[PDB]
Scaffold this active site. Structure first.
Site, PDB file in Angstrom:
ATOM      1  N   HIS C 393       0.825  -1.186   0.000  1.00  0.00           N
ATOM      2  CA  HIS C 393       0.000   0.000   0.000  1.00  0.00           C
ATOM      3  C   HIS C 393       0.870   1.252   0.000  1.00  0.00           C
ATOM      4  CE1 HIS C 393      -3.228   2.796   1.280  1.00  0.00           C
ATOM      5  NE2 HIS C 393      -4.003   1.947   0.626  1.00  0.00           N
ATOM      6  N   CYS C 394       2.039   1.204   0.643  1.00  0.00           N
ATOM      7  CA  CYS C 394       2.880   2.397   0.636  1.00  0.00           C
ATOM      8  C   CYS C 394       3.577   2.589  -0.685  1.00  0.00           C
ATOM      9  CB  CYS C 394       3.951   2.327   1.726  1.00  0.00           C
ATOM     10  SG  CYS C 394       3.271   2.382   3.425  1.00  0.00           S
ATOM     11  N   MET C 395       3.863   1.475  -1.346  1.00  0.00           N
ATOM     12  CA  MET C 395       4.556   1.411  -2.627  1.00  0.00           C
ATOM     13  C   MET C 395       3.709   1.619  -3.885  1.00  0.00           C
ATOM     14  SD  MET C 395       7.512  -1.450  -2.177  1.00  0.00           S
ATOM     15  CE  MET C 395       6.939  -2.444  -0.880  1.00  0.00           C
TER      16      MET C 395
END
Lengths: 409, 406, 405, 406
Positions: C393-395
């Site tokens: 999700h951060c990537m």
């Protein structure tokens, strides 16, 4: 049987290791700092890679001993278990309302299972229901207190720290951080009771898990038998001089060695163990963290009857690698530098362990350094640093040589 | 008879320790290594300390300076052999300097000896020799510390290492190994000094010769408040391994009926009880609201139907109501610290008797609320002694203090 | 065409990612803190684990755009490149002793390399021998000073951070550490000049690289379009109310949203982005770190005509999850709490479509539970990309994602 | 005399200082870390120590300006009040639902009141009861957020930092940190609007509130116009190379300095600012912290019309002390070294005139040395003022100091 280590590069015949286990299973992001461990690791994968490490060594004839097996075996001898529990379970250690209960339950367990607990700590919850246990449960509930009666010891993984075989004997190291003296308690139990040691012949040069030792601390990563009567002992944060001094006297006293070369790390880089910035790969080849190794002040400590304390120490103006070189009869050592020319990225390939001259085990990730070892003639067998690596320790840190042959100098 | 029978009772005998050499050796690089906040102004610290000392003596309190006591103790050869045999070993000094440090120390004039035992001894203090020189060499080139004998600037806080609890005293196993060196000195004093040798008093817990492992105790956490009750703060430096044992012994000599374990919350476990909660009068306590309202109290009592002859219950009430009722009181008059001009922490004053307390010049507001609530507040200077984190209470080790009609 | 993110679990069609690159080649243990990054990673192995990531996304049919590629196509347009450069190479950043060289040089390189230097930073050694670059080598050798004309930006790897797509418009984030606003510049350039963005229809809710935003900061892991006019936004230490308020106002003003549910993160916790302690996996299924999520104070921010500043705020008494549940028209959301074997943090997975999510292989437990809950979990290695403190999700930066109701 | 500082040791004619105040009253152990303060200080004793110091210069003839005083007077000119407010009160700094409230209120205060708050910061509680201040008091209540709308500016007390007079002009310094950017605004408003400044001739060499500056930072402690057209600028962590070269370029352009010698410090993140390690006490005297000064690496920056950027940097081969002395047309500089009774740090004194400095009473060792070297040492207390990491020098912004070579 003769147990002893007489070099850094020579053929390795018996090594003791410890696989990550229950201890590591209790690592959480908040408690890993006060349980003296870098980060949280994937335990099941870390075991698989350690087993890969253990097998690449065994496949080559080396005898590899896993601490959990030895401990399991040692614990079956009633006397051995009692010797450990008498010193591990005390009012002062667990609280007077728990010793009785704690002890009876551990004694109620199957050998193997017990070893796992002696190494990975025991939590309030692991006990059967009680007042003793419940009281602890509420100190955690209502005050935020630890729920470990017996703390885990994830650092068992680095068998190199706790003890050191220096020629015909071993040191029972007084650990810098007090909580780590529990590891020495157990490796001492093994060496004292297990059949592979209890009969074997070898000297105990320094240490006693009974005494207190005070400011005398010593850590494995700092000690090295390079052969030719020499021993390199790094003196920085974890290995104090009052220890290094006694280890020398003790050794000189039984003719184990003719010279102890104290490698003084400057305050700045003093939290680093010597095998973290300096490692052997072959009779005359070493890996080095330049910036640090060029700042080490070498001091030769040798036998002397003209002194009351029977020793002489002279500061050395030649560089550390020069002193090392000359103490082995060599004109100079070849050097591979780790920690800017055509490096594609930063890697730290110090801490490989030699299986024999010219064969080494290191981490997959230190491709650039590993490449330089091969061009200079070393076979580099690699293992995954993915989980073991997050431990701030490499092959060298993860092995404790018990039987190693020497080389001609 | 030696013994501290309350917190507010009339104080007659107390031990203090002025800053000295140990503090002369402070550097901003070694503050933390030596466990001392900042580098104070020593000569000025000694004057401020002396003023504190003088103000108590003028109230007729018999104030004993740790250096005087030690100096007099070590004139007794036997006293001195006991100490050096434990302080100067291969393990603490290194086998190369045991003879030269010992003898040299044995050659000095008594007072200078006590200054060194408390203030440490460096490589340069010693006559020129091989050992001295290498210790120096280590300092020059590796930046290594060069103390054969390390300084104990925390001796200034006599409340830490020993506790007088009714007709007895604890010989406190310190959280930091470094500071167990202070316990060794005070022990020698209570052992040999005349003021103690002949005197009657029990030794409840502790022993400078043993390894207590995880048992640790710090003076600030202990308070014999009267009515056979002892409060003991439980946090980062006083463990249950230690506290449990203190209770058992106290109860084994009828020296106490109940110990109330002040459970400090994890956020505040670094704080000593006497630094967030302090008595000023028969029913008056300064307080650090935030922390004090979160203390979880635990009542400890003797119980013959216990394998360890003890019983424990968590008090549903607040820490202050539990203390209140333990002394037969209803409410507890409370002054809060932490309208107000600025921030000031007025906890940690020390009573010389009911209604009379000694506090710092700097906490004006708390100081005036204590006078408004009926307390004479003698004030001492904080500019140096107070950088050291500790107050009047941390700087005094009560030996004789009268009881209170509860 | 028309770009826009319309939920967290809906079919994902277009996502932007960034592969570890020269930025990470520059990580040293003595600088990876002052450069913000958990630790030095194995770069080449992280590139492979990231490519494996792109691959698992592409094969499910998702259009995965890559920052370096995207940047590269972008700077081929001299205008686009002159816009980035005019702003990145000044005397206040490079210094007056280098601006013309460092610029002249970058301009003489081929697009794919220039782009690697913009994300990777540029050192004094890299520059063509000059009196300028040399005094900097000088400051490095003698003073131990950073010898970086342009920074490394290792966090470009986490694309979720610098820009947020919310219902047919985007937020160009004011970042907390000024040494990360360089990232936001580059992405703005892409959304401005690249062909896939130049012509597409979409708005710019908040943000601007030419302004200094003072205390208004915004971080993407804090922003989530969950659906019918609702937007969740975390309020930690990285997302300020001065920023959350202006995004909310702009959204309301433009019809773009009906309510923004401010996620109040508690003091200790306020260092974690919302998507770190909370993530969607399906229409009514989320993972959460219990300790944190039960303590978060929800606040509904709605548009109000009768308000001087157009809005109204009400602290909700229902727990964060009941609030989010009700906001979605649901009775209750199912929950897999994570954070039986060992510790693990299974949060931060990215939904590819309802019920399919990409996570890390290490989090066995949590994934085992997630699969029992009806979710197919595709995993990738956290070995090196995970030393970044962020997951799938951060990537990812969703650019096109379908609604759900 | 027109405005301009022309040396470090010459006669001091006009200075600006700032005393402790409301900002230091807002310090609490839980925040003095951000706002850069070693601990909370006793504000009223601090105010007496500040003044005393002001008085010791005032009685020697020096015209001493006080920042609250100047801001206060400055505020009375509406336009100037608008300038500030228009930049200190935005939607980005305070937030959408507070802009009107905070301003309407601030503008309700009386000049000495408004200035108080501008520096000491405004809290939520200071505002009139309202929803806007309540949603802000709710976040504090439930999430634990800060209560500060405007943040306290305790470092103002160190007026050396935000602006520097270098010969005939001044720099408006883009500060490193966050809890310091806001200060330069205030002092810029004084220099722009206030009567003693509005009407005087002088140059603005570098700096501007209104612009961003990026990684260009300069902090006063690092700047010293030592006369003879030489300017000294320390290069470390708060003084970047991008600001330094721009400062030398404007100075060299208007021919205000002939050479700028960069004292590049070695690494560490502990800050450590040139005047905290190197200080002038007399035309050939200077205090030095050996450990650090011997590590400094001198760089000379002189103008060069041919070169592209009209200047050329040539690294120096002799030490920092020999280059300095050599730039002054001197054989050598005499030095007093600091950090044999205790540890001392007497750097940072401030010359009132050649041979007359003002330092701290606690540094008796370095002060005796200084008097022995022919200098008169006037002393102030550090008890509270030196709890903030700064001495006479960090506490002064010279505006008018004559040229040496007298």
């Amino acid at each position: 049987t003769k147990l002893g280590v007489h070099s850094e590069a020579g053929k390795l015949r018996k090594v003791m290791v410890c696989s990550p286990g229950l201890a590591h299973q209790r690592l959480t992001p908040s408690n890993c700092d006060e349980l003296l461990f870098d980060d949280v690791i994937w335990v099941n994968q870390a075991k698989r890679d350690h087993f890969d490490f253990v097998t690449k060594m065994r496949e080559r004839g080396i005898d590899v001993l896993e601490m959990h097996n030895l401990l399991t075996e040692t614990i079956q001898n009633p006397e051995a278990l009692k010797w450990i529990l008498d010193r591990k379970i005390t009012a002062d250690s667990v609280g007077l309302g728990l010793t009785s209960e704690l002890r009876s339950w551990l004694e109620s367990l199957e050998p193997r299972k017990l070893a796992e607990y002696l190494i990975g700590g025991v939590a309030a919850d692991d006990l059967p229901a009680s007042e003793g246990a419940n009281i602890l449960k509420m100190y955690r509930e209502y005050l935020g207190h630890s729920s470990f009666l017996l703390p885990p010891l994830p650092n068992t993984q680095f068998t190199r720290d706790t003890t050191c075989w220096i020629y015909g004997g071993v040191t029972l190291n007084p650990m810098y951080w007090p909580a780590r003296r529990q590891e020495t308690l157990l490796t001492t139990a093994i060496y004292k009771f297990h059949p592979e040691f209890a009969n074997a012949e070898f000297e105990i040069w320094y240490g006693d898990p009974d005494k207190d030792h005070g400011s005398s601390t010593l850590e494995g990563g700092d000690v090295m038998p390079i052969g030719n009567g020499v021993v390199l002992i790094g003196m920085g944060e974890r290995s104090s001089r009052q220890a290094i001094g006694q280890v020398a006297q003790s050794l000189f006293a039984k003719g184990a060695a003719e010279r102890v070369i104290v490698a003084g790390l400057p305050k700045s880089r003093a939290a680093m163990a010597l095998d973290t910035v300096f490692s052997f790969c072959d009779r005359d080849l070493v890996t080095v963290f330049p910036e640090v190794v060029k700042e080490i002040v070498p001091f030769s400590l040798r036998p002397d009857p003209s002194s009351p304390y029977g020793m002489n120490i002279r500061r050395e103006e030649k560089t550390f690698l020069e002193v090392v070189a000359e103490s082995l009869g060599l004109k100079k050592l070849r050097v591979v530098e780790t920690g800017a020319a055509e490096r594609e990225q930063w890697d730290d390939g110090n801490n490989v362990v030699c299986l024999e001259p010219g064969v080494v085990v290191g981490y997959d990730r230190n491709t650039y350094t590993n490449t330089l070892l091969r061009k200079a003639g070393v076979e580099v067998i690699t293992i995954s640093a993915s989980e073991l690596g997050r431990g701030r320790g490499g092959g060298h840190c993860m092995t404790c040589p018990i039987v190693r042959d020497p080389i001609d100098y």
